[PDB]
């Protein structure tokens, strides 16, 4: 009721919400804004972030042919898993990006399964497996987080997009550009509970 | 630049377009949204879409908390990558998705990359497999349209998306959901030149 779309909606009921983004841009931008994308690309920012309904870059408000999206549980960077490392060959090699996010967000409930031992089935078990690496490589803090549960799962997900950052400076790509000083490179949370994004210190 | 923001966009640039998105949702719908959204996440679609900066569900214009999305080079799903098979098992056994997309697109390079006969370089190369292995399995059909390669990349980039779509029925918790009929899972193509989208029929 209070989202746009539902679970009884037809077909042409997503036709029309599109209908009207075709519309909305329309207006506020006229025809320039789908003749440059019809013609190419050139993105500014790569946002690497969790596939969470409401952890979307949507919450940058931007039109398209702007960001460079990839998103996955618990936005994860993993060296070892060619989604990943292959977008960002090409974010970097190819379209010369000048500004790479990796965002994770409250109330990330890949993180509450990392705290949890519950196994979960599938991959998904194996595929949460570098969040909780870093669940053992910080428990000495962690720990301490008992009684409040809420600060564990915020604490661990910073730490997993510090992780899934320097995960990112490592790769050749990255390496080579930020040496040269033709990228940069932050770290975001997605508050989920109020739309704001909040900075994360980066340590080196 | 007719963008909302700029490659040598400060900082700072992002933080407002972040705090407008916040005031949009407000303004129109209350504190409602990120009330709901605080509390936890119930999406009704599962959208597999490329990753191209162009081709975002915002082609749908939905509020945070509707569309789990997971995006990567040239939209492809196949049942080794532990990235998309994970959100596939998670999309339908614990979200209860109702219904899955999966969207090409138009001046998708990474179908055009794979309509070249030189090798593209770094882990890029082996991403696109499943592309050049369907353009092989569908030459006879290919072997049209070299009057004008645009009709082609159009021929291929569809192909590919059907192609992600029988493999993500292939899943079992998918095979299993449609069996019961309990989901239901479409394909179609985003234009971008226009951004109307297009369904694509999925046979058996
Ligand atoms: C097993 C697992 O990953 N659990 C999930 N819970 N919430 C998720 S989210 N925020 O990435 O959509 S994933
Ligand atoms: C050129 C190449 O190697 N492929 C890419 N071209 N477009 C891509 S996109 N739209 O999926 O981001 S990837
Ligand atoms: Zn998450
Ligand atoms: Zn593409």
């Known amino acids: 009721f209070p989202f746009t779309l539902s679970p ?31 013609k190419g690309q050139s993105p500014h920012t790569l946002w690497i972030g969790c596939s969470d309904s409401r952890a979307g870059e949507q919450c940058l408000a931007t039109l398209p042919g702007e960001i460079f999206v990839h998103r996955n549980i618990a936005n994860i960077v993993n060296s070892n898993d060619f989604s990943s490392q292959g977008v960002i060959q090409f974010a970097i090699d190819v379209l010369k990006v000048k500004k790479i996010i990796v965002c994770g967000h409250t109330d990330c409930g890949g993180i509450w399964a990392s705290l949890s031992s519950k196994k979960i089935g599938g991959v998904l078990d194996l595929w ?77």
């Open 8 to 38: 009884d909606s037809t077909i042409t009921d997503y036709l029309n919400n599109n209908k009207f983004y075709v519309d909305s841009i329309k207006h506020n931008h006229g025809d320039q804004i789908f003749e440059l994308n019809g």
């Open 128 to 204: 949460l497996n570098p969040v909780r690496h870093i669940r053992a490589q910080n428990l000495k803090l962690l720990e301490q987080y008992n009684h409040e549960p809420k600060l564990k799962a915020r604490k661990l997900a910073e730490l997993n997009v510090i992780a899934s950052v320097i995960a990112l400076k490592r790769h050749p790509s990255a390496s080579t550009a930020l040496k040269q000083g033709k990228i940069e490179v932050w770290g975001m949370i997605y508050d989920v509970a109020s739309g704001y994004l909040s900075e994360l210190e980066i340590p080196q």
